[PDB]
Design an enzyme around this catalytic site. Structure first.
Site, mmCIF file in Angstrom:
data_model
loop_
_atom_site.group_PDB
_atom_site.id
_atom_site.type_symbol
_atom_site.label_atom_id
_atom_site.label_comp_id
_atom_site.label_asym_id
_atom_site.label_seq_id
_atom_site.Cartn_x
_atom_site.Cartn_y
_atom_site.Cartn_z
ATOM 1 N N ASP A 124 0.836 -1.181 0.000
ATOM 2 C CA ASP A 124 0.000 0.000 0.000
ATOM 3 C C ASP A 124 0.869 1.228 0.000
ATOM 4 O OD1 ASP A 124 -1.964 1.962 1.816
ATOM 5 O OD2 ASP A 124 -3.285 0.422 0.945
ATOM 6 N N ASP A 260 -7.769 -9.058 -2.983
ATOM 7 C CA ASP A 260 -7.745 -7.620 -2.899
ATOM 8 C C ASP A 260 -8.522 -6.940 -4.024
ATOM 9 O OD1 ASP A 260 -7.228 -4.916 -2.140
ATOM 10 O OD2 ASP A 260 -5.138 -5.057 -2.635
HETATM 11 CL CL CL Z 1 -5.430 5.195 0.951
#
Ligand code: CL
Length: 310
Positions: A124, A260
């Protein structure tokens, strides 16, 4: 100078599976008066340094199952908390959090601690920021463990890195809505939704750093920086592509959390093509966005791939 607040220490009294001692820096160049927390585990004189970068809306607690695997292999492990998260200090205004604010903190940290032979571990936001680091001082980076993440380039250069923002509706659209809209954001409930295997105790470790909303400005700005990329982010992320493609000569290990909805197969296959020498990815079938919650297996496998080359 930057108006910030600090989470009360008692908030972290009852953490589950987080027996790591705190380390702090409050003397970073460009970051006056701000205290950053970071884990420093395993042998501090180790040749190998695993630099573990967390993302939205978590902290170093995310790598808790990974840290011990890496430390047991004889590597020193560094896991910092970005300003706005975990045990680090939290600027109170969303305008204070920028791509460069967080990126320069990382370069400052790396320099301040003089990290070398770094194995970058990202996911991320840890990756959006993290992947733009090697090109600034390539001699310090040697390996990469990449879990669901990509580069924040412009939509024309890499459409796959922009497409997930709008579709599907229960993807990044849902995530951002869940994060920027509630006036009473409960991180434990958010985490149990996006990481369904978390226990109650684990879920509350993610709400621990934020007693109330005044503490969550950095939490709130992250999703917005995904949707509204400023020019420095675009230029820097565009310049990192060239680096991964032509300049990088290290070892890579990729793991994809298959369930995901944000950064799955269609974001990470294209990422695999841009990283010179990246091998076939380890696809984890039962894993969602937070691959790290199936972290032991990834750490174990990554070490085994890396050892089959030394
Ligand atoms: Cl984010």
């Amino acid at each position: 100078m930057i108006n910030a607040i600090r989470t009360p220490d008692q908030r972290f009294s009852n953490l589950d599976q987080y027996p790591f001692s705190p380390n702090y820096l409050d003397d970073l160049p460009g970051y006056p008066g701000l205290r950053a927390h970071y884990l420093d585990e395993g042998n501090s004189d180790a040749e190998d340094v695993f630099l573990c970068l967390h993302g939205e809306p978590t902290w170093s607690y995310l790598y808790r199952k990974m840290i011990p695997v890496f430390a047991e292999s004889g590597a020193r492990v560094i896991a910092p908390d970005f300003f706005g998260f975990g045990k680090s200090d939290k600027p109170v205004d969303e305008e204070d959090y920028t791509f460069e604010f967080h990126r320069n903190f990382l370069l400052a940290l790396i320099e301040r601690l003089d990290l070398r032979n770094i194995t970058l571990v990202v996911q991320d936001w840890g990756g959006f920021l993290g992947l733009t680091l090697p090109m600034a001082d390539p001699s310090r980076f040697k390996r990469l463990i990449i879990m669901n993440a990509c580069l924040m380039t412009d939509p024309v250069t890499q459409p796959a890195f922009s497409a997930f923002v709008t579709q599907p509706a229960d993807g990044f659209t849902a995530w951002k809505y869940d994060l920027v809209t509630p006036s009473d954001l409960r991180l434990d409930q958010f985490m149990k939704r996006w990481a369904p295997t978390l226990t109650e105790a684990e879920a509350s470790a993610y709400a621990a750093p934020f007693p109330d909303t005044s503490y969550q400005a950095g939490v709130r700005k992250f999703p917005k920086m995904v949707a509204q990329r400023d020019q420095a982010c675009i230029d820097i992320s565009t310049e990192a592509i060239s680096f991964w493609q032509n300049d990088w000569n290290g070892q890579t290990f990729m793991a994809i959390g298959m369930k995901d909805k944000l950064l799955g197969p269609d974001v990470m296959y294209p990422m695999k093509a841009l990283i010179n020498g990246c091998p076939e990815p380890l696809e984890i079938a039962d894993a969602g966005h937070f691959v790290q919650e199936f972290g032991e297996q990834v750490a174990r496998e990554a070490l085994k791939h890396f050892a089959e080359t030394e």
